[PDB]
Amino acid sequence: MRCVGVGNRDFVEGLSGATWVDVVLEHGGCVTTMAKNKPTLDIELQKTEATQLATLRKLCIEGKITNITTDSRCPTQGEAILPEEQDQNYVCKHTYVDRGWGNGCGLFGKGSLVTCAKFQCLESIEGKVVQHENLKYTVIITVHTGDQHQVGNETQGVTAEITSQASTAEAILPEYGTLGLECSPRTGLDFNEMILLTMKNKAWMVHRQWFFDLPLPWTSGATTKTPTWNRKELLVTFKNAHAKKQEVVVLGSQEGAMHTALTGATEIQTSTSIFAGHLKCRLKMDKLKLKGMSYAMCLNTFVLKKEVSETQHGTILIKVEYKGEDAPCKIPFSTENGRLITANPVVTKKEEPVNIEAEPPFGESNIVIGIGDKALKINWYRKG
Amino acid sequence: MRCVGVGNRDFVEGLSGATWVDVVLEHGGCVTTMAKNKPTLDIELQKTEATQLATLRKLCIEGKITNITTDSRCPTQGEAILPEEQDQNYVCKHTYVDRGWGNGCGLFGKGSLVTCAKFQCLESIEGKVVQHENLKYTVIITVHTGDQHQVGNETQGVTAEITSQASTAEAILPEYGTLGLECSPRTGLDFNEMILLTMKNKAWMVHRQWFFDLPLPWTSGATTKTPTWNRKELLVTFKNAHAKKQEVVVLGSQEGAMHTALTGATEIQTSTSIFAGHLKCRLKMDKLKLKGMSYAMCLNTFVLKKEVSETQHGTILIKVEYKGEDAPCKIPFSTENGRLITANPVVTKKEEPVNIEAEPPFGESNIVIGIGDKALKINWYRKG
Ligand SMILES: *[C@@H]1O[C@H](CO)[C@@H](O)[C@H](O)[C@H]1NC(C)=O
Ligand SMILES: *[C@@H]1O[C@H](CO)[C@@H](O)[C@H](O)[C@H]1NC(C)=O
Ligand SMILES: *[C@@H]1O[C@H](CO)[C@@H](O)[C@H](O)[C@H]1NC(C)=O
Ligand SMILES: *[C@@H]1O[C@H](CO)[C@@H](O)[C@H](O)[C@H]1NC(C)=O
């Protein structure tokens, strides 16, 4: 009863006689499966993960400038040159300035000037690549056992891992047998065309070309404590207004600009990186066995321990307490179209209440729980 | 000789007989004025300033979030409400979540949830308005005196202030008289349509509508230590992915985004705010008097104290030293089309050299400085 309370909940019933049920799990959704003489299951796709990621390119979003140097020449003395022009850490620019007697040259004319600034990246973002061969899907299965605290509890449930290599897996359901999962991980997208952009805590999924065409300084994917940046001029600007001076300034943090650019992109939790995805599976229930089919009927009384309330999908939840000593026994259930969602409701201990999910028909109907005169009669109306 | 060495230099000569010269000064430019029997002047527009500015609107570029509160209700209990919804410091959002037995409600259905976050701006930018009634133009005038250190020296020169109210002004030129400035401050742009955007040290001139349509939280121009921001949701986002949770996060610094948006805008030095502008003036030289017109000629020798060099505009600079005792005297100057830029070159002291700017004709010409056999003869060729 994990999906009881989830709005995006699907009910799937297997074909007549078949012991297999085909389901489509998607993020934020829950599917309830029913089969004749089989336990009612609540299956959910918990998370979709990428296990190991290789960084393709690394982009600088905030940088600073240090160790500025400059060299100037008088007219007709040739272009000025600095060794830092061949240092890949520095960004340099050549220009011409007005030179004459007033500024220390014998000749009047245009004199060469060159400025170099060492560039250091303060904050960067990464673009890691995801290949579907490394994707891991985690599925969670919860049996409708009637357990006391079962309704909407995300603590209990058996998890099973599906990978592109290990697509079929078996999940051991305690006291109910073994479930088969024959899933086919359909990519949903071409992963070469998409790149995982990670910035600080946050992460997104963006187009490869869009990431590569980001107007930011970039460096190879290989991590280095001292990296060599290209396109450093996309953050460093040289200004020479009136041929007197040349000042170099850095562009400032592009963090918020990236946030705006990432508005229309799919966002991903953390940077453990969990995707929002889907997965199609075939559930083999041949090895699944209903726990209390061989139990006898409960000969005593049931008492309502909680008000009957309606689910968003029209089903009702009944919490009953048994007052007899023959447990474990089968709960007598009959409607005076009316069916059960929970298959084979049973009492395990007298002290523990039982939760039953039922699908009453539209209109007035009488839910009879127990047998005989002392049976519980709950009148109910289902309005469409 | 302030413009000697400036590349953007204009030469203007007054009409025949007139004692007035019309000039157009613009930022980064220098104009040299000549008139018969009048001192040669080097006029320049130093700066254009706005004296007092009123802030129209103030926009937040970086904010943070504190004191988050939230309230939730079970289904059919009505919409949740917080008092912080009526606090203008908080940004709030209403949503609906899945509620049922599992999360503490007796009824299954959609339950109301409301979240509020107190917003605080960390960094802001201002949009101050400039009206042409407060503009101040500063003009600098430098006489061609022949002074020892006059070439390109920006230390010497008389400054005069022109304002839209005080358009005509008089500038006292020591030893040369009084200059009249009849300027007409033409706006160049409609100042209501333009707003001065100031961010940290930097400032720009942008369109009013563009500034008002900036997607940032804004507040009135009046300065307050505790301001009230509008459009706070332009920096604060609420995320509710699957009807389980609602997390509130701030957008981050928009500083670099603003820098990119301001790429095509005119930049202004500091935030003392100096514009790049122009000014048209009429120079009245009726009260200007040439210092040494009544001096006698220099009867002795001149010696070249520095190599003759050519200016970017074809003129030549001659630095001579006088070796006689009759100073002050008129320097004999003759070409063997050839004219002087510096009007009435004179020797003031024997120990101080004299700088003369001359315009030699194209081709071969002989510059004769001094009189007699002992006169200085400098051969020169001007190539076009
Ligand atoms: C770079 O310049 C600064 C100038 O303050 C100096 O401290 C530093 O030693 C220089 N070199 C390196 C490698 O930091
Ligand atoms: C949820 O399940 C755990 C596991 O048995 C149980 O201990 C807990 O009390 C339950 N709580 C609920 C349903 O609130
Ligand atoms: C806001 O919340 C914080 C919670 O840490 C608290 O310290 C503070 O006193 C609260 N109110 C104000 C006015 O800061
Ligand atoms: C510039 O002018 C000042 C003012 O007389 C003078 O003291 C200085 O030596 C000059 N320096 C130059 C032209 O380098």
- Residue A150 CA: nearest ligand 2 atom is 13
Contacting residues for B276 by C-beta, under 8 A, at least 6 apart: A241, B27, B28, B48, B266, B268
Chain-chain contact of B110 with A311 (C-beta, under 8 angstroms):
no
Q: Which of A220, A193, A215 is nearest to A205 (CA)?
A: A193
Ligand 2 pocket test, candidate residues A2, A147, A155, A158, most atoms within 8 A of CB: A155
Nearest to B5 among A98, A259, A311 (CB): A98
**Cα(A184) to centroid(ligand 3), Å:** 52
| Residues of chain A contacting B153 with CB distance shorter than 8 Å | 102
Does the beta carbon of A156 lie inside 6 Å of ligand 2? yes
Q: How many helices (H) and strands (E) does chain B have?
A: 2, 28
Does the beta carbon of A148 lie inside 6 Å of ligand 2? no
- Residue A149 CA: nearest ligand 2 atom is 13
3-state secondary structure B334-377: EECCCEECCCCCEECCCCCCEEEEEECCCEEEEEEECCCCCCEE
For residues B2 and B142, give the distance between their C-alpha atoms in angstroms, rounded to a whole number. 6
For residues B241 and B24, give the distance between their C-alpha atoms in angstroms, rounded to a whole number. 64
Q: Which of B312, B90, B104, B372 is nearest to B217 (CA)?
A: B90
The gap between the terminal CA atoms of chain B, to the nearest Å, is 24
Chain-chain contact of A100 with B311 (C-beta, under 8 angstroms):
yes
| Dihedral sign of CA atoms A274, A279, A284, A285 in order | positive
A156 interfacial to chain B (CB closer than 8 Å):
no
B136 min Cα distance to partner chain A (Å): 21
Q: Which of B61, B57, B58, B59 is nearest to B251 (CA)?
A: B61
Distance of CA B173 to the CA centre of its chain: 26
For residues A90 and A232, give the distance between their C-alpha atoms in angstroms, rounded to a whole number. 9
Of all protein residues, the one whose alpha carbon is nearest to atom 8 of ligand 2 is A149
Collapsing DSSP to helix, strand or coil, A331 comes out as coil
Say if residue A185 is exposed, middle or buried (CB neighbours under 10 Å; 0-12, 13-18, 19+): buried
Residue A133 structure tokens: 């061969």
Round the CA-based radius of gyration of chain B to a whole number and report it.
34
Does the beta carbon of A153 lie inside 6 Å of ligand 2? yes
B18 min Cα distance to partner chain A (Å): 33
B108 interfacial to chain A (CB closer than 8 Å):
yes
| Resolution for this PDB entry, in angstroms | 2.8
Considering every ligand atom shown, identify the ligand nearest to the alpha carbon of residue B154 and give its number: 4
| Residues of chain B contacting A106 with CB distance shorter than 8 Å | 306-307, 309
Chain-chain contact of B101 with A312 (C-beta, under 8 angstroms):
no
The count of other CB atoms within 10 Å of the CB of residue A351 is: 9
Chain-chain contact of A5 with B251 (C-beta, under 8 angstroms):
no
B9 interfacial to chain A (CB closer than 8 Å):
no
Interface of A with B in 320-359 (CB under 8 A): none
| Residues of chain B contacting A154 with CB distance shorter than 8 Å | 102
A377 interfacial to chain B (CB closer than 8 Å):
no
Residue B224 structure tokens: 């307050």
Which position has the token pair 């997208």?
A189
Chain-chain contact of B99 with A5 (C-beta, under 8 angstroms):
yes
Which position has the token pair 């009669």?
A377
The gap between the terminal CA atoms of chain A, to the nearest Å, is 24
Q: Which of B48, B273, B53 is nearest to B161 (CA)?
A: B48
CA dihedral B279, B285, B288, B292 (to 10 degrees): 110
Q: Which long-range contacts (CB under 8 A, 24 or more apart) does A190-197 make?
A: A191/A129, A191/A130, A191/A131, A191/A132, A192/A131, A194/A130, A195/A56, A195/A127, A195/A128, A195/A129, A195/A130, A196/A50, A196/A53, A196/A127, A196/A128, A196/A129, A196/A130, A196/A268, A196/A273, A197/A125, A197/A126, A197/A127, A197/A262, A197/A265
Nearest to B254 among A8, A256, A312 (CB): A256
Chain-chain contact of A100 with B27 (C-beta, under 8 angstroms):
no
A47 interfacial to chain B (CB closer than 8 Å):
no
| Residues of chain A contacting B61 with CB distance shorter than 8 Å | 256
Contacting residues for B323 by C-beta, under 8 A, at least 6 apart: B300, B301, B302, B303, B350
| Residues of chain A contacting B109 with CB distance shorter than 8 Å | 312
For residues A262 and A254, give the distance between their C-alpha atoms in angstroms, rounded to a whole number. 12
The torsion angles phi and psi of B136, rounded to 5 degrees, stand at -130, 120
Backbone φ/ψ region at A209: left (φ over 0), alpha (ψ -120 to 50), beta: alpha
User: Which string of DSSP letters, residue by residue, matches B258-307?
Assistant: HHHHTTTSEEEB----EE--EEEEEEE-TTB--TTTTPPBP-S-EEEEEE
Chain-chain contact of B106 with A306 (C-beta, under 8 angstroms):
yes
Provide the pairing of β-strand A41-50 with A54-72: unpaired
Provide the pairing of β-strand A316-322 with A339-340: unpaired
Residue A121 structure tokens: 């990246």
B157 interfacial to chain A (CB closer than 8 Å):
no
Contacting residues for A306 by C-beta, under 8 A, at least 6 apart: A319, A353, B101, B106
Does the beta carbon of A149 lie inside 6 Å of ligand 2? yes
| 8 Å CB contact between A162 and A103 | no
> What was the elucidation method?
X-ray
- Residue B151 CA: nearest ligand 4 atom is 13
Does the beta carbon of B200 lie inside 6 Å of ligand 4? no
Residue A280 structure tokens: 């199609």
A152 min Cα distance to partner chain B (Å): 4
Q: Which of B31, B20, B24, B16 is nearest to B285 (CA)?
A: B20
Chain-chain contact of A108 with B256 (C-beta, under 8 angstroms):
no
For residues A280 and A10, give the distance between their C-alpha atoms in angstroms, rounded to a whole number. 14
| 8 Å CB contact between A105 and A74 | yes
Distance of CA B268 to the CA centre of its chain: 6
Distance of CA B213 to the CA centre of its chain: 26
Collapsing DSSP to helix, strand or coil, A256 comes out as helix
- Name residue A153's amino acid: N
Segment holding B250, helix H or strand E = strand B247-250
A130 min Cα distance to partner chain B (Å): 23
Q: Which of B54, B279, B272, B282 is nearest to B188 (CA)?
A: B279
Provide the pairing of β-strand B135-143 with B41-50: antiparallel
Interface of A with B in 201-240 (CB under 8 A): none
**Cα(A119) to centroid(ligand 1), Å:** 13
- Name residue A266's amino acid: T
For residues A43 and A74, give the distance between their C-alpha atoms in angstroms, rounded to a whole number. 80
CB pairs under 8 A between A and B: 127
Considering every ligand atom shown, identify the ligand nearest to the alpha carbon of residue B152 and give its number: 4
Of all protein residues, the one whose alpha carbon is nearest to atom 8 of ligand 4 is B149
A241 interfacial to chain B (CB closer than 8 Å):
yes
Residue A350 structure tokens: 């007298």
Closest CA in chain B for residue A262 = B251
For residues B305 and A188, give the distance between their C-alpha atoms in angstroms, rounded to a whole number. 85
In DSSP terms, which residues pair with B266 in a beta bridge?
B205
For residues A298 and A328, give the distance between their C-alpha atoms in angstroms, rounded to a whole number. 8
- Residue B150 CA: nearest ligand 4 atom is 13
In DSSP terms, which residues pair with B135 in a beta bridge?
B50
**Cα(B103) to centroid(ligand 2), Å:** 11
| 8 Å CB contact between A382 and A365 | yes
